[PDB]
Amino acid sequence: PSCKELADLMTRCMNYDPNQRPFFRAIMRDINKLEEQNPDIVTEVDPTHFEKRFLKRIRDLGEGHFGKVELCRYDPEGDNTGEQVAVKSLKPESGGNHIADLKKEIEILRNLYHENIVKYKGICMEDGGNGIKLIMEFLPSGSLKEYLPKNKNKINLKQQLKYAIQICKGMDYLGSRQYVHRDLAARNVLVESEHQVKIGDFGLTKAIETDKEYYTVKDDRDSPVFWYAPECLIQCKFYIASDVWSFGVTLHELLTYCDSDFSPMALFLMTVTRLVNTLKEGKRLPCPPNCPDEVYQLMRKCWEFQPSNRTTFQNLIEGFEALLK
Numbered sequence: 496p497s498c499k500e501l502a503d504l505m506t507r508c509m510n511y512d513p514n515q516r517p518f519f520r521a522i523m524r525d526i527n528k529l530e531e532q533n534p535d536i537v538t539e540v541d542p543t544h545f546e547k548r549f550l551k552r553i554r555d556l557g558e559g560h561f562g563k564v565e566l567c568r569y570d571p572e573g574d575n576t577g578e579q580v581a582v583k584s585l586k587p588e589s590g591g592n593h594i595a596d597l598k599k600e601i602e603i604l605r606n607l608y609h610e611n612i613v614k615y616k617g618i619c620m621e622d623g624g625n626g627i628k629l630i631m632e633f634l635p636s637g638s639l640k641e642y643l644p645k646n647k648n649k650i651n652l653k654q655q656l657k658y659a660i661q662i663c664k665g666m667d668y669l670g671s672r673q674y675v676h677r678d679l680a681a682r683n684v685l686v687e688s689e690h691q692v693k694i695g696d697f698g699l700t701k702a703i704e705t706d707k708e709y710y711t712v713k714d715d716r717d718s719p720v721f722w723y724a725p726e727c728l729i730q731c732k733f734y735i736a737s738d739v740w741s742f743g744v745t746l747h748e749l750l751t752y753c754d755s756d757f758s759p760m761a762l763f764l765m766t767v768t769r770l771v772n773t774l775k776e777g778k779r780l781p782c783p784p785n786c787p788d789e790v791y792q793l794m795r796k797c798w799e800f801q802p803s804n805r806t807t808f809q810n811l812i813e814g815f816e817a818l819l820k
């Protein structure tokens with residue numbers, strides 16, 4: 496509040512230690528005293544903002560096609576202890592337009608809430624208006640691509656089924672509010688501790704309209720070559736079920752433990768023309784080696800090039816839970 500005496504009472508009542516809050520009779524006594532004591536009838540501590548001056552670097556890890564990510568510790572105290580954070584930031588190299596997309600990305604992560612999504616922690620900026628730096632939580636285990644090779648033998652098919660299941664709920668949550676992530680792969684999907692996976696960044700997020708079930712792209716050079724729905728080249732239109740193919744490829748890699756050369760780009764043997772002709776001719780990739788029959792038999796349906804033949808994520812989790820049971 497704006498009155499010195501009342502703020503004291505509110506602070507005493509609203510203490511974070513439940514055994515230090517005062518008794519109600521003391522509250523009544525203090526209110527009665529305050530009433531007669533003051534005949535007069537009449538800077539913020541917002542934690543979501545960070546300042547670069549108190550950010551301390553430790554090491555660098557991770558990079559992307561639209562920014563860099565580093566590990567830092569925030570400690571305005573005597574630097575004895577603090578909180579380890581991951582700081583999404585741009586780079587001066589050709590950063591003439593990253594500001595708008597970074598602002599939009601900040602906007603998206605402030606309006607989402609689900610368990611299978613990386614938490615938002617705050618924002619940071621400098622005096623120049625540019626230099627905006629997103630700060631989000633840090634996952635010690637990194638992404639799945641960096642985890643499965645490290646524990647290929649220790650892991651089990653049970654946890655593989657669990658991991659394949661969990662990201663589907665996050666994707667369904669994203670599709671609920673009419674968002675398309677436009678890029679899904681192992682490097683983006685994160686894993687924390689065990690049995691928990693949270694989706695990574697949302698840089699290329701765009702929202703479709705009710706009157707048009709597809710988005711418009713002016714330049715397709717940014718998209719990766721072999722995570723590419725056929726409509727993205729045939730008509731340059733982005734549909735929600737486009738990432739279903741992406742999820743199927745991610746599932747295949749998940750069963751593959753991120754092998755050295757079994758990735759479809761490495762597995763495949765003028766790239767655009769070859770891809771188009773193979774898609775029209777149905778030259779789909781075969782099943783993974785040593786793969787159980789039922790899972791890839793189920794996955795084969797979603798790989799179908801027709802968007803209409805693709806199933807909803809709800810149906811996929813239904814099938815997966817039926818198989819698990």
Ligand SMILES: Nc1ncnc2c1ncn2[C@@H]1O[C@H](COP(=O)(O)OP(=O)(O)O)[C@@H](O)[C@H]1O
Nearest residue numbers: 557558559560564581632633634637638683696
């Ligand atoms: N919250 C986090 N905690 C730990 N590592 C992270 C976090 N977010 C991203 N990374 C690291 O970033 C790498 C993935 O790069 P990413 O930032 O997704 O590229 P892009 O910027 O193109 O999205 C991974 O190797 C992962 O270790």
